[PDB]
Amino acid sequence: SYYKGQTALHIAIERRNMTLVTLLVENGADVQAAANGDFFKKTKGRPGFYFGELPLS
Amino acid sequence: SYYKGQTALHIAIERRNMTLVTLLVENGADVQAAANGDFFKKTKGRPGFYFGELPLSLAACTNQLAIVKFLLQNSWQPADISARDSVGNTVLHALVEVADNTVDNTKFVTSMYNEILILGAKLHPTLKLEEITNRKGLTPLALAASSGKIGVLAYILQREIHEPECRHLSRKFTEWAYGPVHSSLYDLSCIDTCEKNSVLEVIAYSSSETPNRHDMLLVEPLNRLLQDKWDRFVKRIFYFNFFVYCLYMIIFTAAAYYRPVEGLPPYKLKNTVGDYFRVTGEILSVSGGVYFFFRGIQYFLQRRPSLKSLFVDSYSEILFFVQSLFMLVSVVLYFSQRKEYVASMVFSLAMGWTNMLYYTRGFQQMGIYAVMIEKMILRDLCRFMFVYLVFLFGFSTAVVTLIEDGKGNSYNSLYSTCLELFKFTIGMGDLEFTENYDFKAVFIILLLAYVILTYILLLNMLIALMGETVNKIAQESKNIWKLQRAITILDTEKSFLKCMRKAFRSGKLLQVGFTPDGKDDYRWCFRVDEVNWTTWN
Amino acid sequence: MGWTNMLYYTRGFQQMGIYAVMIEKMILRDLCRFMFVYLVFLFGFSTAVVTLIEDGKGNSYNSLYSTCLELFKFTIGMGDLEFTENYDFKAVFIILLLAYVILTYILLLNMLIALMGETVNKIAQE
Ligand SMILES: COc1cccc(NC(=O)/C=C/c2ccc(Cl)cc2)c1
C-alpha cells in the first residue's frame, strides 16, 4: 500500500521544521525508514522526485 | 449638446482630488452619470480616450484607488458595478480597453483589476461580473484576447488568490507542493472551443491587425494545452490527412501523365483495364478538386478573412483554392471539346505538388523553414523582382531598339531579347548571341551594364537581404509556426462537430474548493507540474 | 567513399576539425531540409512539364527522368529554357519553367546561403 513506506518523520522533514522532527525522533523513532514507493522513484515521466529512501537522504 | 453628458463629479475625478469629489458627492450627487459624448467614444482617429460612461469607470481606468474605494463603500447611492455602458463595456471591459503593453500600465490595470474584482465579490458574492458581455458579446477575457492585451490575459489565466473565502474567484488552483515540486491546476472555463467566443478561437481567427497575436499563445497554459491536444488526438489525424493528400497527388500525377494524345476530348471508354484505371484517376482527381473548392468557400464564409492583407495569413488556403479552381476550369474545358484543358490541369498539378509544404507545419523544424520561405517571398523576393523587371525591361527595350535585322535573325521581338537577358540572369547568357546590330560597342556596353547591375549587384544584394531577414525573423517564424499549428488543431477538432465530441475534450472535471454559497466548484482543470528551488514556502 | 572519408583525419588539426564539424552539421541540419523542399518542387514541376509534352510528331523527352534532369541542370545553372519544342502551348511551358527558376534558383539557393550563414554564426562554438 502507498501509505506504508512513508513515516511521520518523512512528512515532518518535508515541512522542514527542526523542532517537530526532533520531537518526533526523541522517543527513539526509527531512522532506517525506506520510502520504497513508486511516487519516490526516479522516473521523470511520472510526478514526484526521487531523493533517497532514507530520511537522511 | 457637449456640456450635458459631463458632471462636476467627472471633472473632479479628473483632477484626482479625493476631498473635492467627496465634498461634491456628500450632498447626494448622482453616481449614474453617463458621459455619452463623442469626445469619450472609443474612436482612435479622434482626440480623447474612452474610459467608461460611469464615473466609477473613469476612476477605475485612472489609478484613483481612493475614489473607487469610497464610491463602492459610500453610505448613499452605491453605484452598481455591473453596468452595461453605451458600447456595453463594463468597467472591466473599459480597463481592458485602456490596457496597453506598457509595463506600468499593465501593473496598474492588473492591481486595480484584482482589487475591483474582490470589491465586487464582497458587494455581490453571487454576481457574475466577469461574465457580463458587451454588445459585441465578448467577456473581458475575450475582449483582451481580441485586442491583443497580453498582460491582462497572463494575469487572468494565472490569477491566484490566497484568501480562503474569496479565493474561489481565482483561475489557477494550486493543489500541493511536496518540496520544490508542486502541481498547478487551471480553469479552462472558456479557453477551450466550448463557448460562443473562446479565447483560443479568438486568437486563431483574429486578423494580423491585433498585435502580438502569435506571441500571446506563448503563455504557459495555452501552449501546454495546445501541445497536449496535438500529442493526444490531432497528430494522428494530421498524418492521416497528409497521407491521403499524398495519395491524391500521386493519383493526379499518374492520371494526367497518361492522358490520351489522339483525338479531341472527351475520349472513349475502352474495354481495357488501362482506360478504366485512367478514368478512375481522373474522377478521383476531380473529386479532390471539388472538395478543396468547397473547403475554400467554407473557409471564406466562416472566417470572412481580412480583405486588406489576405496573403499574409491565408496564403496556403488561397493556393489550395487556386488549385481547385484550375482543376474545375480544366474539367469545364475538357467537356467543351476543347484541348486547352492541358494547361489548366498542368498548373493545378504543379500547384498541388508545391502545396505539400502546407503539411510541414506538423513538424517543428520544417514548419519554420516553410514560414521563412513564405516571409522571404512576400518580403524580399517581391522587391527584388520589381527592381529586376524594371532593369530587364529597360535594357531589353534598349537592345531590341539597337537590333535592326536588315539583311539568329528573328530577334527583333521583345520576348526573345527579354528571354536572353533572363538567361544572362540564370548564368546561361551569351554575350554575342546575335550580330545583327550596327554598333558592337553599344551592344556590348548595354549587355555589360545589365550584367553588372543585375547579376553582380542585385543577386548578391538579394542574398545579403535574405541573411538579414533570416537573422531578424527566426523567432517570428517560430511563433508563426506555433500559431499555424494552433489553427490546424482548431480546424481539426471542429471538423468532427457531428462525428463525435466527448473524447475531443481537454482537462479533467475537478472539485477542489467551495463557493461562499457552501457549494462545490466543478471546473475542468488541467495540471501543470513545476519545480522551483528558491521559493520554498 | 574512401576518398571522401579522408576528412575523418582532419580532427587531429585544430582548424580543419572545426571545418569538418561544420560540414557535417550543415549536412544534417541545413542541406537535408533544402533537399526535401527542392525535391518536392522539382518533382512537381517536372511532372507538370512531362504532362505538357506530347511528342506526337530532342524527341524522347517524355520520360520523367529526362525532364527532372533538365530541371536539375536549371538548378546548377546549365538549364536551357527551350530544350524542346514538342509541347502544344509555349506560354504554359515558359510560365512553368520561369516559376521553377524563380522558386528554386532565385529563392531556395539564396535562402540556403542565408541559413548557412545563420547556422555558422550560431554553431561556431558548438
Ligand atoms: C503553403 O506552402 C507554400 C509556401 C511557399 C510557396 C508555395 N508554393 C507556391 O508559391 C507556388 C506558386 C506557383 C504559382 C504559379 C505556378 Cl504556375 C506554379 C507555382 C507553397
XYZ file of C-alpha atoms and ligand atoms in Angstrom:
740
model
C 0.000 0.000 0.000
C 1.099 3.578 -0.660
C 0.706 4.767 2.946
C 3.217 2.352 4.483
C 6.625 3.314 3.081
C 6.290 6.826 4.487
C 6.608 7.700 8.164
C 5.745 10.771 10.209
C 9.459 11.610 10.117
C 9.353 11.894 6.322
C 6.489 14.406 6.254
C 7.965 16.246 9.243
C 11.222 16.699 7.324
C 9.166 17.778 4.309
C 7.832 20.664 6.412
C 11.468 21.479 7.322
C 10.525 22.067 10.974
C 13.534 21.104 13.086
C 11.605 21.224 16.366
C 8.871 18.924 15.059
C 11.315 16.324 13.727
C 13.452 16.337 16.875
C 10.311 15.904 18.979
C 9.298 13.006 16.733
C 12.677 11.272 16.953
C 13.302 11.992 20.651
C 11.230 8.961 21.666
C 13.544 6.832 19.511
C 11.843 6.820 16.121
C 13.372 4.511 13.530
C 15.895 6.302 11.306
C 16.123 3.470 8.746
C 12.685 4.117 7.228
C 12.774 3.364 3.497
C 10.372 5.166 1.146
C 10.036 2.308 -1.340
C 7.093 3.941 -3.109
C 6.630 4.497 -6.824
C 5.897 8.160 -6.082
C 9.526 8.455 -4.946
C 11.030 6.508 -7.857
C 13.444 8.209 -10.236
C 11.063 8.081 -13.215
C 10.815 11.512 -14.843
C 7.683 10.624 -16.822
C 5.681 10.435 -13.577
C 5.045 13.003 -10.826
C 7.316 13.277 -7.801
C 11.094 13.386 -7.492
C 13.461 10.743 -6.134
C 15.582 11.939 -3.208
C 16.579 8.707 -1.444
C 14.680 6.139 0.590
C 16.350 7.086 3.873
C 15.064 10.180 5.702
C 18.676 11.341 5.922
C 18.746 11.231 2.121
C -25.039 69.418 -26.511
C -21.475 68.611 -25.464
C -21.737 70.173 -21.991
C -24.550 67.947 -20.716
C -23.126 64.419 -20.534
C -20.406 65.565 -18.145
C -20.984 66.436 -14.499
C -18.914 68.216 -11.872
C -18.099 64.764 -10.486
C -16.402 63.796 -13.754
C -14.054 66.796 -13.814
C -13.477 66.483 -10.063
C -12.329 62.888 -10.565
C -10.194 64.094 -13.475
C -8.318 66.316 -11.010
C -7.902 63.225 -8.777
C -8.738 65.252 -5.652
C -10.425 62.893 -3.195
C -11.554 65.691 -0.873
C -13.193 67.632 -3.705
C -15.095 64.614 -5.041
C -16.269 63.501 -1.597
C -17.468 67.042 -0.888
C -19.305 67.005 -4.219
C -20.989 63.654 -3.586
C -21.718 64.220 0.120
C -24.911 66.119 -0.724
C -26.066 63.042 -2.655
C -24.798 63.671 -6.174
C -25.956 61.191 -8.800
C -23.455 58.364 -9.320
C -25.110 57.066 -12.514
C -23.941 59.966 -14.697
C -23.229 58.708 -18.219
C -20.676 60.521 -20.395
C -22.384 59.777 -23.711
C -20.208 62.252 -25.605
C -18.290 61.680 -28.817
C -15.179 63.029 -27.083
C -15.331 59.949 -24.839
C -16.033 57.443 -27.624
C -13.556 54.664 -28.348
C -12.553 56.044 -31.761
C -8.761 56.217 -32.040
C -8.839 58.510 -35.083
C -10.242 61.330 -32.926
C -8.904 63.040 -29.787
C -9.791 61.795 -26.316
C -9.802 58.311 -24.819
C -12.759 56.141 -23.828
C -12.754 55.121 -20.160
C -16.412 54.300 -19.454
C -19.560 56.386 -19.182
C -19.922 55.867 -15.432
C -17.748 57.990 -13.119
C -16.753 54.763 -11.376
C -15.418 53.579 -14.735
C -13.457 56.824 -15.108
C -11.948 56.384 -11.646
C -11.118 52.736 -12.362
C -9.409 53.490 -15.681
C -7.390 56.042 -13.743
C -5.293 54.759 -10.849
C -7.596 56.528 -8.350
C -7.774 53.839 -5.679
C -9.376 56.107 -3.071
C -12.228 57.298 -5.295
C -13.307 53.770 -6.202
C -12.939 52.591 -2.604
C -15.143 55.405 -1.292
C -17.771 55.210 -4.048
C -18.049 51.427 -3.680
C -18.407 51.856 0.108
C -20.422 55.090 0.335
C -23.467 55.026 2.604
C -25.744 56.517 -0.081
C -26.264 55.655 -3.746
C -23.598 52.936 -4.141
C -23.080 52.576 -7.880
C -23.911 49.231 -9.480
C -20.628 47.697 -10.617
C -22.384 45.594 -13.278
C -23.421 48.369 -15.672
C -23.706 47.977 -19.434
C -22.435 51.231 -20.931
C -23.415 52.705 -24.300
C -20.962 50.357 -26.084
C -21.726 47.702 -23.438
C -18.199 47.798 -21.957
C -18.466 47.132 -18.205
C -15.822 48.812 -16.039
C -13.762 45.645 -16.512
C -14.108 45.976 -20.285
C -13.004 49.610 -20.081
C -9.996 48.523 -18.023
C -9.105 46.031 -20.747
C -9.551 48.746 -23.408
C -7.226 51.134 -21.542
C -4.677 48.352 -21.021
C -1.507 48.594 -23.101
C 1.638 46.515 -23.455
C 3.464 49.104 -21.329
C 4.820 47.630 -18.104
C 3.499 50.305 -15.734
C 0.088 50.372 -17.416
C -0.004 46.590 -17.031
C 0.829 46.969 -13.335
C -1.962 49.487 -12.784
C -4.650 47.749 -14.851
C -3.689 44.425 -13.180
C -3.588 45.520 -9.492
C -6.726 47.633 -9.886
C -8.357 44.763 -11.793
C -7.747 42.416 -8.865
C -8.864 44.983 -6.296
C -12.139 45.876 -8.018
C -12.808 42.185 -8.656
C -12.503 41.414 -4.941
C -14.556 44.500 -4.060
C -17.363 43.373 -6.355
C -17.106 39.910 -4.830
C -17.641 41.475 -1.406
C -20.585 43.534 -2.674
C -22.373 40.768 -4.629
C -20.612 37.449 -3.944
C -23.142 35.707 -6.229
C -22.841 38.145 -9.153
C -21.090 37.086 -12.364
C -19.405 40.420 -13.022
C -16.695 38.801 -15.174
C -19.256 37.009 -17.383
C -21.113 40.158 -18.483
C -20.733 40.727 -22.224
C -20.889 43.967 -24.191
C -22.887 44.437 -27.392
C -20.156 42.638 -29.356
C -20.772 39.710 -26.993
C -17.246 39.277 -25.588
C -16.391 38.994 -21.893
C -13.315 40.897 -20.644
C -11.161 37.826 -21.293
C -12.367 37.587 -24.895
C -12.081 41.355 -25.354
C -8.482 41.304 -24.116
C -7.678 38.382 -26.411
C -9.197 40.160 -29.417
C -7.476 43.484 -28.670
C -4.107 41.831 -28.023
C -3.711 42.761 -24.341
C -1.091 40.220 -23.309
C -0.568 41.387 -19.726
C -4.248 41.187 -18.813
C -4.502 37.738 -20.394
C -1.454 36.499 -18.484
C -2.984 37.804 -15.261
C -6.399 36.225 -15.812
C -5.091 32.847 -16.977
C -2.762 32.820 -13.939
C -4.871 34.765 -11.432
C -4.236 33.387 -7.941
C -5.663 34.326 -4.540
C -4.544 33.091 -1.112
C -7.593 34.345 0.914
C -9.656 31.111 1.515
C -13.028 32.876 1.431
C -12.512 34.871 -1.790
C -10.009 32.511 -3.436
C -12.857 30.967 -5.447
C -12.566 33.982 -7.783
C -9.257 32.556 -8.983
C -8.120 30.901 -12.208
C -5.217 28.697 -11.038
C -5.922 26.455 -8.033
C -2.593 25.267 -6.652
C -3.044 21.716 -5.368
C 0.038 20.773 -3.329
C 3.778 21.360 -3.034
C 5.816 18.365 -1.838
C 9.141 20.150 -1.647
C 10.145 22.128 -4.738
C 7.696 20.056 -6.814
C 4.143 21.400 -6.947
C 1.183 20.918 -9.269
C -0.696 23.844 -10.828
C -4.318 23.319 -11.835
C -6.077 25.740 -14.186
C -9.690 26.693 -15.095
C -10.221 26.184 -18.870
C -13.706 27.623 -18.323
C -13.690 29.489 -21.651
C -10.264 28.644 -23.101
C -11.433 25.522 -24.928
C -13.643 25.584 -28.024
C -16.663 25.132 -25.772
C -18.222 28.624 -25.653
C -19.627 31.144 -28.106
C -16.372 33.118 -28.433
C -13.449 31.208 -26.928
C -10.012 32.625 -26.206
C -8.254 30.126 -28.470
C -10.710 30.682 -31.322
C -10.371 34.452 -30.900
C -6.576 34.255 -31.038
C -6.568 31.894 -34.019
C -9.122 33.699 -36.199
C -8.123 37.239 -35.241
C -6.592 39.099 -38.166
C -2.986 40.275 -38.169
C -4.165 43.749 -37.115
C -4.190 42.815 -33.433
C -0.584 42.995 -32.176
C 1.350 40.027 -30.814
C -1.420 37.610 -31.784
C 1.183 34.860 -32.239
C 3.036 35.930 -29.074
C 0.028 35.607 -26.755
C -0.096 31.853 -27.385
C 3.276 31.587 -25.612
C 1.523 31.875 -22.244
C 2.139 28.661 -20.327
C -1.461 27.342 -20.071
C -2.349 27.832 -23.733
C 0.940 26.409 -25.021
C 0.746 23.356 -22.767
C -2.914 22.757 -23.647
C -2.282 23.063 -27.387
C 0.655 20.663 -27.281
C -1.468 18.291 -25.193
C -4.259 18.289 -27.778
C -1.759 17.828 -30.609
C 0.079 14.929 -28.954
C -3.212 13.324 -27.870
C -5.732 13.415 -30.723
C -4.656 15.718 -33.591
C -1.218 14.464 -34.687
C -2.666 11.177 -35.946
C -5.475 12.893 -37.862
C -2.979 15.340 -39.355
C -0.742 12.487 -40.511
C -3.733 10.645 -41.977
C -4.743 13.755 -43.926
C -1.145 14.205 -45.089
C -1.059 10.613 -46.354
C -4.422 10.987 -48.097
C -3.250 14.162 -49.829
C -0.069 12.390 -50.922
C -2.209 9.623 -52.418
C -4.420 12.172 -54.174
C -1.420 13.972 -55.666
C 0.081 10.678 -56.838
C -3.225 9.702 -58.453
C -3.492 13.086 -60.170
C 0.086 12.812 -61.435
C -0.401 9.291 -62.786
C -3.730 10.147 -64.420
C -2.513 13.336 -66.102
C 0.785 11.742 -67.151
C -1.091 9.024 -69.074
C -3.527 11.410 -70.769
C -4.558 10.426 -74.312
C -2.870 12.479 -77.024
C -5.011 11.398 -80.028
C -8.491 12.784 -80.772
C -10.108 15.875 -79.343
C -11.735 15.432 -75.907
C -13.793 13.843 -74.466
C -12.273 10.388 -75.084
C -13.827 6.945 -75.427
C -14.459 4.402 -72.681
C -12.433 1.412 -73.856
C -12.910 -2.191 -72.661
C -9.291 -2.305 -71.418
C -8.326 -2.134 -67.756
C -5.958 0.728 -68.548
C -8.736 3.062 -69.669
C -10.826 2.146 -66.621
C -7.927 2.964 -64.296
C -7.312 6.223 -66.166
C -10.962 7.222 -65.752
C -10.769 6.299 -62.067
C -7.732 8.542 -61.681
C -9.402 11.431 -63.494
C -12.608 11.169 -61.452
C -10.680 10.892 -58.179
C -8.709 13.999 -59.149
C -11.913 15.882 -59.957
C -13.481 14.799 -56.662
C -10.474 16.057 -54.722
C -10.542 19.323 -56.639
C -14.214 19.975 -55.940
C -13.702 19.050 -52.286
C -10.905 21.613 -52.000
C -13.071 24.175 -53.810
C -15.893 23.726 -51.306
C -13.429 23.758 -48.403
C -12.039 27.087 -49.596
C -15.524 28.551 -49.955
C -16.384 27.329 -46.452
C -13.213 28.940 -45.104
C -14.059 32.236 -46.801
C -17.619 32.298 -45.462
C -16.890 31.133 -41.901
C -13.807 33.291 -41.357
C -14.592 36.242 -43.639
C -10.832 36.891 -43.627
C -9.372 40.368 -43.826
C -9.505 41.789 -47.340
C -6.679 44.270 -46.688
C -3.949 41.605 -46.388
C -5.102 38.039 -47.063
C -1.715 36.945 -48.468
C -0.085 37.070 -45.017
C -2.442 34.800 -43.022
C -4.323 32.739 -45.653
C -1.587 32.032 -48.195
C -1.862 28.240 -48.184
C -5.663 28.197 -48.262
C -5.571 30.639 -51.170
C -3.173 28.321 -53.004
C -5.369 25.269 -52.381
C -8.389 27.210 -53.640
C -6.477 28.264 -56.759
C -5.504 24.649 -57.440
C -9.125 23.536 -57.108
C -10.290 26.382 -59.353
C -7.740 25.442 -62.019
C -8.878 21.818 -61.912
C -12.527 22.864 -62.211
C -11.671 25.050 -65.214
C -9.847 22.086 -66.756
C -12.935 19.921 -66.258
C -15.108 22.653 -67.783
C -12.928 22.818 -70.895
C -12.363 19.065 -71.241
C -16.112 18.610 -71.777
C -16.345 21.588 -74.170
C -14.485 19.648 -76.888
C -11.517 21.960 -76.308
C -7.871 20.942 -75.921
C -6.733 23.832 -73.701
C -7.539 21.838 -70.557
C -3.939 20.584 -70.595
C -2.674 23.986 -69.441
C -5.123 24.267 -66.543
C -4.530 20.667 -65.474
C -0.747 21.127 -65.550
C -0.968 24.315 -63.494
C -3.198 22.543 -60.972
C -0.740 19.636 -60.807
C 2.271 21.863 -60.147
C 0.331 23.879 -57.564
C -0.778 20.697 -55.822
C 2.754 19.331 -55.614
C 4.115 22.643 -54.317
C 1.266 22.739 -51.773
C 2.584 19.655 -49.979
C 4.538 22.210 -47.931
C 1.284 23.002 -46.120
C 1.884 19.743 -44.242
C 5.349 20.701 -42.954
C 3.652 22.576 -40.102
C 3.199 19.364 -38.125
C 6.989 19.126 -37.753
C 8.829 21.672 -35.645
C 11.885 22.211 -37.871
C 10.332 22.092 -41.346
C 7.492 24.382 -40.279
C 9.990 27.143 -39.541
C 11.509 26.573 -42.978
C 8.112 26.954 -44.659
C 7.355 30.102 -42.659
C 10.716 31.593 -43.635
C 10.162 30.573 -47.326
C 6.828 32.482 -47.280
C 8.246 35.534 -45.414
C 11.119 35.833 -47.919
C 8.659 35.509 -50.813
C 6.354 38.279 -49.561
C 9.190 40.441 -48.172
C 12.440 40.014 -50.135
C 11.650 38.286 -53.439
C 8.856 40.700 -54.389
C 11.009 43.831 -54.137
C 13.908 42.210 -55.977
C 11.536 41.012 -58.693
C 10.130 44.527 -59.087
C 13.544 46.157 -59.468
C 14.851 43.333 -61.657
C 11.867 43.553 -64.001
C 12.405 47.308 -64.286
C 16.062 46.797 -65.229
C 15.367 43.856 -67.546
C 12.618 45.653 -69.445
C 14.694 48.810 -69.803
C 17.785 47.098 -71.163
C 15.743 44.714 -73.333
C 13.906 47.601 -74.982
C 17.281 49.286 -75.456
C 18.712 46.192 -77.142
C 15.740 45.476 -79.413
C 15.920 49.121 -80.448
C 19.589 48.586 -81.291
C 18.876 45.466 -83.359
C 17.938 46.230 -86.968
C 17.755 42.919 -88.883
C 18.066 44.453 -92.338
C 19.816 41.527 -94.019
C 19.637 34.157 -85.157
C 17.608 36.595 -87.258
C 14.113 36.970 -85.717
C 15.454 38.519 -82.520
C 13.575 41.796 -83.049
C 10.708 40.585 -80.860
C 10.946 41.933 -77.322
C 10.195 38.450 -75.993
C 13.397 36.968 -77.424
C 15.634 39.712 -76.032
C 13.951 39.639 -72.619
C 14.420 35.865 -72.524
C 18.083 36.246 -73.491
C 18.681 38.724 -70.676
C 16.879 36.457 -68.214
C 19.197 33.670 -69.369
C 22.009 36.088 -68.541
C 20.474 36.283 -65.069
C 20.464 32.489 -64.586
C 24.069 32.281 -65.792
C 23.424 30.999 -69.326
C 23.670 34.266 -71.253
C 25.613 34.560 -74.497
C 27.228 37.983 -74.855
C 27.287 37.539 -78.659
C 24.029 35.719 -79.367
C 23.407 37.941 -82.406
C 25.476 40.191 -84.709
C 22.557 41.968 -86.452
C 23.232 45.270 -84.670
C 25.038 48.192 -86.299
C 27.344 49.224 -83.416
C 29.054 46.426 -81.493
C 30.403 48.795 -78.834
C 26.914 49.953 -77.839
C 25.589 46.388 -77.729
C 28.470 45.203 -75.551
C 28.195 48.239 -73.269
C 24.479 47.641 -72.734
C 24.987 43.941 -72.032
C 27.860 44.654 -69.631
C 25.805 47.257 -67.772
C 22.932 44.791 -67.463
C 25.221 42.032 -66.180
C 26.892 44.345 -63.664
C 23.631 45.794 -62.361
C 21.624 42.550 -62.128
C 23.955 39.545 -61.945
C 26.789 41.089 -59.828
C 24.817 43.641 -57.737
C 21.162 42.626 -57.452
C 21.504 38.884 -56.780
C 24.392 39.258 -54.308
C 22.321 42.038 -52.668
C 19.361 39.649 -52.548
C 21.471 37.089 -50.692
C 22.569 39.779 -48.226
C 18.978 40.883 -47.623
C 17.956 37.249 -47.146
C 20.637 36.857 -44.492
C 19.455 39.981 -42.692
C 15.821 38.868 -42.868
C 16.600 35.372 -41.573
C 18.562 36.749 -38.627
C 15.703 39.148 -37.906
C 12.728 36.788 -38.218
C 13.898 33.418 -36.876
C 11.810 33.921 -33.716
C 8.829 35.420 -35.540
C 8.829 32.364 -37.805
C 8.861 30.067 -34.774
C 5.871 31.867 -33.261
C 4.037 31.899 -36.596
C 4.521 28.144 -36.925
C 3.083 27.707 -33.433
C 0.058 29.786 -34.447
C -0.352 27.816 -37.688
C -0.367 24.534 -35.778
C -2.891 26.042 -33.362
C -5.214 26.907 -36.251
C -4.765 23.381 -37.592
C -5.749 21.956 -34.198
C -8.828 24.177 -34.032
C -9.988 23.196 -37.518
C -9.305 19.505 -36.895
C -11.321 19.356 -33.685
C -14.088 21.451 -35.259
C -14.395 19.133 -38.264
C -15.737 16.359 -36.009
C -18.592 18.504 -34.661
C -21.115 15.898 -35.832
C -18.748 12.909 -35.759
C -18.085 12.989 -32.007
C -17.177 15.456 -29.271
C -16.959 13.673 -25.917
C -13.432 12.300 -26.306
C -12.403 15.531 -28.086
C -12.253 17.411 -24.779
C -9.258 18.559 -22.743
C -8.911 18.843 -18.986
C -10.418 16.853 -16.136
C -13.514 17.809 -14.150
C -12.210 18.567 -10.653
C -13.736 19.884 -7.425
C -11.085 21.487 -5.205
C -12.721 24.384 -3.364
C -16.126 25.785 -2.489
C -18.178 28.888 -3.231
C -19.371 31.292 -0.498
C -22.784 29.689 -1.071
C -21.457 26.495 0.535
C -21.317 24.594 -2.768
C -18.668 22.959 -4.946
C -16.501 24.276 -7.796
C -16.810 21.739 -10.628
C -14.359 23.016 -13.247
C -12.290 21.402 -15.990
C -8.781 21.865 -14.607
C -5.531 20.936 -16.352
C -2.446 20.001 -14.343
C 0.978 21.572 -14.850
C 3.783 20.343 -12.532
C 6.522 22.884 -11.687
C 9.815 22.638 -9.727
C 11.302 25.737 -8.069
C 14.302 25.687 -5.728
C 14.167 29.250 -4.327
C 10.530 29.978 -3.433
C 10.478 27.230 -0.791
C 7.347 28.466 1.002
C 33.512 6.919 -50.108
C 37.078 6.136 -49.081
C 38.445 9.317 -50.629
C 35.709 11.438 -49.041
C 36.414 9.723 -45.701
C 39.907 11.217 -45.517
C 38.126 14.066 -43.712
C 37.939 11.797 -40.660
C 41.624 12.634 -40.182
C 41.123 16.419 -40.081
C 40.237 16.094 -36.387
C 43.907 15.998 -35.411
C 44.254 19.613 -36.584
C 42.501 22.376 -34.686
C 41.293 24.473 -37.641
C 40.313 21.776 -40.145
C 38.471 19.802 -37.469
C 36.084 22.710 -36.962
C 35.548 22.817 -40.723
C 34.654 19.115 -40.807
C 32.293 19.507 -37.849
C 30.575 22.448 -39.543
C 30.383 20.491 -42.875
C 28.581 17.648 -41.021
C 26.271 19.995 -39.030
C 25.204 21.793 -42.230
C 24.600 18.440 -43.941
C 22.361 17.086 -41.164
C 20.748 20.467 -40.387
C 20.540 22.723 -43.464
C 21.142 20.601 -46.573
C 18.549 17.963 -45.652
C 15.658 20.421 -45.334
C 16.623 22.252 -48.517
C 16.904 18.939 -50.357
C 13.441 17.917 -49.152
C 11.778 21.136 -50.303
C 13.773 21.224 -53.542
C 12.825 17.648 -54.411
C 9.171 18.493 -53.775
C 9.365 21.481 -56.133
C 11.428 19.656 -58.762
C 9.122 16.645 -58.872
C 6.015 18.816 -59.053
C 7.217 20.986 -61.914
C 8.796 18.033 -63.743
C 5.536 16.086 -63.661
C 3.790 19.243 -64.863
C 6.200 19.594 -67.784
C 6.164 15.943 -68.866
C 2.378 16.175 -68.786
C 2.626 19.207 -71.068
C 4.938 17.433 -73.523
C 3.078 15.363 -76.120
C 5.619 14.111 -78.696
C 3.078 13.345 -81.406
C 5.330 14.013 -84.395
C 15.110 16.140 -78.675
C 12.134 13.801 -79.048
C 12.257 11.161 -76.265
C 11.792 13.733 -73.510
C 8.513 12.196 -72.314
C 10.346 10.181 -69.659
C 10.178 11.830 -66.246
C 13.901 11.194 -65.805
C 14.863 13.469 -68.703
C 12.698 16.367 -67.528
C 13.837 16.022 -63.912
C 17.451 16.040 -65.102
C 16.789 19.130 -67.225
C 15.321 20.989 -64.256
C 18.245 19.931 -62.069
C 20.530 21.331 -64.769
C 18.498 24.520 -64.401
C 19.401 24.366 -60.712
C 23.156 24.076 -61.385
C 22.978 26.957 -63.867
C 23.085 24.940 -67.103
C 19.378 24.868 -67.942
C 18.083 25.541 -71.443
C 14.722 27.318 -71.373
C 13.949 25.956 -74.869
C 15.451 22.468 -74.790
C 12.387 21.069 -76.582
C 9.530 22.429 -78.734
C 7.291 19.314 -78.649
C 4.717 20.973 -76.378
C 1.434 22.411 -77.644
C 1.361 25.703 -75.680
C 4.624 27.640 -75.448
C 3.211 30.125 -72.932
C 2.420 27.389 -70.403
C 5.838 25.775 -70.841
C 7.650 29.081 -70.358
C 5.484 30.008 -67.366
C 6.215 26.686 -65.666
C 9.950 26.966 -66.315
C 10.030 30.572 -65.082
C 8.140 29.646 -61.915
C 10.575 26.801 -61.275
C 13.600 29.051 -61.813
C 12.197 31.776 -59.559
C 11.226 29.397 -56.762
C 14.376 27.234 -56.741
C 17.290 29.098 -58.333
C 16.492 32.666 -57.094
C 14.723 31.893 -53.769
C 15.772 28.490 -52.432
C 19.536 28.600 -53.058
C 19.961 32.205 -51.867
C 17.835 31.207 -48.835
C 20.136 28.223 -48.306
C 23.152 30.535 -48.214
C 21.374 32.757 -45.679
C 20.511 29.780 -43.473
C 24.110 28.571 -43.723
C 25.319 31.957 -42.516
C 22.917 31.881 -39.579
C 23.914 28.319 -38.684
C 27.641 29.086 -38.855
C 27.261 32.124 -36.606
C 25.206 30.021 -34.195
C 27.346 26.873 -34.032
C 30.968 28.033 -34.272
C 31.481 27.293 -30.559
C 29.481 24.058 -30.602
C 1.993 26.791 -48.492
O 3.307 26.377 -48.728
C 3.984 27.108 -49.709
C 4.940 28.042 -49.347
C 5.607 28.761 -50.324
C 5.320 28.548 -51.659
C 4.366 27.616 -52.020
N 4.053 27.378 -53.418
C 3.962 28.471 -54.366
O 4.144 29.587 -54.023
C 3.626 28.162 -55.820
C 3.464 29.147 -56.674
C 3.128 28.865 -58.135
C 2.392 29.793 -58.849
C 2.081 29.556 -60.178
C 2.511 28.390 -60.788
Cl 2.113 28.083 -62.497
C 3.249 27.462 -60.073
C 3.558 27.701 -58.745
C 3.701 26.896 -51.045
